[PDB]
Design a protein around this ligand. Structure first.
Ligand SMILES: CC(=O)N[C@H]1[C@H]([C@H](O)[C@H](O)CO)O[C@@](O[C@@H]2[C@@H](O)[C@H](O)O[C@H](CO)[C@@H]2O)(C(=O)O)C[C@@H]1O
Ligand SMILES: CC(=O)N[C@H]1[C@H]([C@H](O)[C@H](O)CO)O[C@@](O[C@@H]2[C@@H](O)[C@H](O)O[C@H](CO)[C@@H]2O)(C(=O)O)C[C@@H]1O
Ligand SMILES: CC(=O)N[C@H]1[C@H]([C@H](O)[C@H](O)CO)O[C@@](O[C@@H]2[C@@H](O)[C@H](O)O[C@H](CO)[C@@H]2O)(C(=O)O)C[C@@H]1O
Ligand SMILES: CC(=O)N[C@H]1[C@H]([C@H](O)[C@H](O)CO)O[C@@](O)(C(=O)O)C[C@@H]1O
Ligand SMILES: CC(=O)N[C@H]1[C@H]([C@H](O)[C@H](O)CO)O[C@@](O)(C(=O)O)C[C@@H]1O
Ligand code: NA
Ligand code: NA
Ligand code: NA
Ligand code: NA
Lengths: 99, 98, 98, 98, 98
């Protein structure tokens, strides 16, 4: 399960906690209006990975991408803190877990 | 198979959906006129990977390259949204699947 | 255990040495106030990865992130030099060990 | 063997096609006059990886380096389009094959 | 053993050739005075990887760091061309071997 630190952090926001997600697809799209980076879960849920041009969020968003790839390749689960304001929901934090 | 999301998004465009592709070769070329990044499938199909200098497309295009390498190394399948307007067809979206 | 070199370096500083840590979670967060990169140990300990905007520290911080990911994927242990001035403690140096 | 696409592209040039090469060593050098990135095959052949500072060839040359490392780690073979004009021969295109 | 090419290149310089090294630790440090990237061998030898902000050495130095991590993760041996003018000795060239 999600670390208590990860849960506490997500609980201070308007975003929602999703635990123990198996990501089975990773999408890169440059088409008009659908452009972005996405992940799809084993049950068909879809989330947008945040992007940012400048420091310091350019670092965190790059690491969210690496976490997504690593999850898809390995079958390791993730915990997400995702805003329900938009569709697909935007990932504001993510936790890769080995166990 | 391709996610419904991926399919819906490709369906909005002039590009073609290609599902369950096994990529077996990855090409980097700097020669005049053939310069680019390409992938080749197990049946001999060839696609050009999109490129972009600036943000935000420089992110997506970098991740296309990472998906292509990961598919070649692992034998994981991909789904593509590829324009037939040129040869080789250009990848506008790609989905790596476990 | 930590190399003597790593131990000596950490000893010059106000930071604390932590040896033989198994990292099992890796966190990226962009939320207000909690924004950052973190690692979590197998027993629940939490550390923040250093960030830096400019050269040369942004090189070293990038490699800390790579070490963290590699440790989580592989189960390889790390040794850390971490400052108690903030919570979670900030990683000033890290050593990945085979 | 090399894809027909890869062969056709190399055929347009003054470079030579080399097929089914096992790369066993990967070299980074910053010494005066020998500075560069190189690969060494299982028979002892040496090639220089192309380098470029600007877009778009900075993308392709980075992917050549990624291909070279991936080949060394995995034992996956490569096909090269390499110019005999210099020594070591310079890689103008490379194909990683599963 | 080290390629003839690698040996010849090191033998042009005042540096020392070290062959068949097993790297077991990789270090990233941002602390004053010890800041840098280092590797430690299975026998406790320590070497520093150089840093460079600009092209072209920013490429070669990045690849030295990739070689170091790959060696630590895999147990693949390296050959080094290392100068005794600094302590730890500085890596001027490195060769990863399968
Ligand atoms: C990624 C991120 O910024 N997350 C914020 C979030 C967004 O900025 C906001 O919802 C716009 O999309 O804002 C959060 O709420 C903030 C409050 O904590 C603060 O009192 O007031 C802020 C506006 O001045 C903002 O509403 C949220 O929605 O939970 C915090 C979250 O980290
Ligand atoms: C990657 C990308 O930009 N994809 C676009 C695509 C191309 O921009 C375009 O084909 C030129 O290379 O354009 C798409 O929509 C086109 C419209 O912009 C155009 O006005 O009308 C076209 C119909 O013939 C078409 O609608 C496309 O070709 O599907 C949208 C796509 O995301
Ligand atoms: C990587 C690259 O630029 N490759 C080119 C190559 C080089 O630009 C050139 O050899 C200098 O390194 O040039 C090629 O085209 C050549 C023409 O530039 C030359 O005028 O005539 C040559 C025939 O003797 C040749 O056509 C080449 O050498 O093949 C094309 C290649 O993509
Ligand atoms: C990462 C870093 O810079 N660490 C350095 C710190 C910090 O600059 C200050 O504590 C202010 O945070 O200063 C030292 O004197 C210390 O406290 O040991 C040396 C150390 O190398
Ligand atoms: C692929 C290619 O032609 N690379 C050449 C580059 C590029 O022209 C520039 O770096 C601009 O991208 O210039 C060099 O002096 C270099 O950087 O080593 C020689 C090299 O052959
Ligand atoms: Na909430
Ligand atoms: Na379509
Ligand atoms: Na100390
Ligand atoms: Na030719």
């Amino acid at each position: 399960g999600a670390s208590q630190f990860f849960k506490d952090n997500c609980n201070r926001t308007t975003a929602s906690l999703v635990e123990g997600v198996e990501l089975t697809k990773y999408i890169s799209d440059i088409n008009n209006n659908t452009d972005g980076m996405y992940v799809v879960s084993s049950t068909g849920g879809v989330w947008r990975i945040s992007r940012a041009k400048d420091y310091p969020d350019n670092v965190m968003t790059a690491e969210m991408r690496k976490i997504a790839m690593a999850a898809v390749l390995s079958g390791m689960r993730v915990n997400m803190c995702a805003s329900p304001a938009s569709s697909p929901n935007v990932i504001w934090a993510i936790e890769l877990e080995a166990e």
